[PDB]
Amino acid sequence: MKFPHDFLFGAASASYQVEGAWNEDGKGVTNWDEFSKIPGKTYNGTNGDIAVDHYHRYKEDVRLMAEMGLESYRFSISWARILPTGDGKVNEKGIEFYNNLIDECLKYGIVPFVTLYHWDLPLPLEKDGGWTNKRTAEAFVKYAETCFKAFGDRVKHWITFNATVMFCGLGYLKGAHPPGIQNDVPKYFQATHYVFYAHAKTVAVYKQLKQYGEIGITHVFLPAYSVDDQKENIQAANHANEYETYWYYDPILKGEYPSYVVQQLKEKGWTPNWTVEELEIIKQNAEENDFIGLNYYQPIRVERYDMDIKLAPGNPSFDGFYRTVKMDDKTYTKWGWEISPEGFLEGLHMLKARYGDIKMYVTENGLGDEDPIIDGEIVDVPRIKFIEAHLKVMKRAIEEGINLKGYYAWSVIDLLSWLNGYKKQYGFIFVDHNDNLKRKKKLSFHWYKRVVETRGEEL
Ligand SMILES: C[C@@]1(C(=O)O)OC[C@H]2O[C@@H](O)[C@H](O)[C@@H](O)[C@H]2O1
Numbered sequence: 001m002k003f004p005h006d007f008l009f010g011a012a013s014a015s016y017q018v019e020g021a022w023n024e025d026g027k028g029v030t031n032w033d034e035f036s037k038i039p040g041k042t043y044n045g046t047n048g049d050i051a052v053d054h055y056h057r058y059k060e061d062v063r064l065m066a067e068m069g070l071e072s073y074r075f076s077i078s079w080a081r082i083l084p085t086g087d088g089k090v091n092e093k094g095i096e097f098y099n100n101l102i103d104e105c106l107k108y109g110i111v112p113f114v115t116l117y118h119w120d121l122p123l124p125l126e127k128d129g130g131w132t133n134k135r136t137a138e139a140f141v142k143y144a145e146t147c148f149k150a151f152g153d154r155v156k157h158w159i160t161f162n163a164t165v166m167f168c169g170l171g172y173l174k175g176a177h178p179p180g181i182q183n184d185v186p187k188y189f190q191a192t193h194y195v196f197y198a199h200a201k202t203v204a205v206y207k208q209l210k211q212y213g214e215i216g217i218t219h220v221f222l223p224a225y226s227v228d229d230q231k232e233n234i235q236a237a238n239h240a241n242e243y244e245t246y247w248y249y250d251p252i253l254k255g256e257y258p259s260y261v262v263q264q265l266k267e268k269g270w271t272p273n274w275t276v277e278e279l280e281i282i283k284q285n286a287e288e289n290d291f292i293g294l295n296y297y298q299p300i301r302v303e304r305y306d307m308d309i310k311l312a313p314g315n316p317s318f319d320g321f322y323r324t325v326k327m328d329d330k331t332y333t334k335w336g337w338e339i340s341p342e343g344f345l346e347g348l349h350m351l352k353a354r355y356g357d358i359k360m361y362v363t364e365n366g367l368g369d370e371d372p373i374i375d376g377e378i379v380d381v382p383r384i385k386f387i388e389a390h391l392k393v394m395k396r397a398i399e400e401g402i403n404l405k406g407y408y409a410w411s412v413i414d415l416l417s418w419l420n421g422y423k424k425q426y427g428f429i430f431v432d433h434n435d436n437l438k439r440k441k442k443l444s445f446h447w448y449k450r451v452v453e454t455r456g457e458e459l
Contacts, residue, residue, distance in 0.1 A: 001455045002395065007405050008111055009452040010072035011065070011412030011428060012364055014118040014162070016048045018415045019078065021055035025093035028084030031126040031178035032119065032418075041176070043421035052415045053437050058101050060439065061413055064429055066108035068445055069452045073110050074363060074408045075101065076118035076162070079143050082150075086122035086139045095150050102154050113363070113408070114151070115159040115218065116144050116202075119167045119177070119418075126179055131168065131191035134278075137198035144202045148209055156213025158206070159293055159363065160199045165220045165248060168192050173318055176419060185318065186270045193272040196251045200285035207288055218293025218363040219248050223347035227303045227325060228310075236304040236322035241350075243317075244300075253355045255286030291405070292355070295364035296390075299343035300324045335368055335424060341389040348397045348404075359403050365390050366410030368417065368424040371442070378430045378442035387448070388458065395456055409448070413439070 016032050036042045054061055081094030102112050125136050170177035172188035199217050206215045224240035226233040246258040265271045302322045314325035331339045367386035371378050398404050411426030430440040
């Protein structure tokens with residue numbers, strides 16, 4: 001019984017990835033609904049139209065989570081289910097559905113942890129300029145307030161945004177996410193600003209509501225290490241960390257943007273169109289966050305741009321100052337992501353040094369795999385070893401006085417990986433695409449049950 005009763009063992013899903021029912025019960029079209037049908041954007045033309053069909057079998061999937069001894073389920077609300085056009089009339093049929101999902105989790109004592117925005121923007125709001133238009137931030141606040149009024153009697157754990165770095169960075173820098181834009185740095189940075197503004201304003205509204213649950217944001221956590229002891233490389237890491245960690249966590253946690261990056265955007269002419277009022281709202285609401293969410297999969301190993309010659313190479317950074325690299329002496333997934341428990345642990349240390357005793361939830365962590373199948377059984381031993389290694393570093397972080405209060409494995413069920421199809425499995429529950437999307441427990445499902453039952457006595 002080592003992890004305290006204070007700490008939730010969970011597993012996670014995202015609405016676009018898991019629900020399907022893209023056109024049902026009054027749901028508005030989203031950006032991912034349109035974007036996924038552009039050839040070249042999703043793996044093998046893979047879709048969320050049906051996804052894994054969680055919308056129609058939510059009762060079954062929740063029964064399974066309960067059978068797994070799950071303590072908390074983290075899912076996302078589809079904004080286009082509540083408010084189809086982003087604003088305007090509320091779709092009651094969408095409110096019914098999330099009330100039913102919430103109520104079913106609750107039957108079995110499973111705690112909802114709810115993400116409001118997991119990348120699936122109602123389409124008009126894309127056409128307005130998405131997160132580059134303050135309007136979308138004001139719309140988001142209204143939506144959040146709608147969800148709070150409708151669901152907040154029962155839901156006491158809320159996430160505003162998920163992984164802003166990806167949706168903003170992939171949407172405006174690489175064109176791999178909607179709206180599909182490439183190398184527009186100013187829009188990227190502007191998008192992150194309006195998101196952080198929407199967050200802080202939403203947090204202020206939630207607290208004025210007097211609902212007595214908790215709220216915070218979920219970021220990607222992607223700690224950057226220097227590939228060696230070389231000063232140029234150390235500097236490349238510092239810079240990586242500034243842009244990938246500090247830009248995101250400082251505004252939410254500290255109430256100020258990191259002056260290092262601010263100085264460089266000014267020089268480059270890329271500073272966002274931000275107002276004093278917006279920055280005050282951010283500044284005054286940094287102290288209102290109850291927690292920080294971490295989606296952590298890997299660190300990155302960096303060398304400076306001109307230290308090739310100075311161990312395979314890496315992708316260059318957006319401003320071309322550094323690049324990430326792969327290395328002989330480390331372990332990678334089959335899609336090339338590093339598996340680094342020591343990476344994660346020092347990462348956690350770096351975060352307590354800067355942000356102090358902030359309450360941390362690991363809102364995503366897991367292994368993407370093409371699962372071994374034997375006699376119709378999914379024997380996903382690699383996933384078990386992945387989660388095991390990460391759970392052990394958490395156990396140690398806690399022993400070391402880090403304020404970690406939950407762990408949500410990425411993918412409670414097999415679902416759609418945005419850009420990797422169904423082939424990049426991440427779940428505890430298998431889904432049979434060849435047998436009418438039927439659910440089967442994997443090896444990992446039974447293992448995780450035991451971990452929760454024992455609260456992590458695994459040495
Ligand atoms: C990007 C991908 C993947 O499919 O590879 O990684 C894992 C996980 O990242 C999370 O940060 C996203 O919220 C979620 O949607 C997941 O999907």
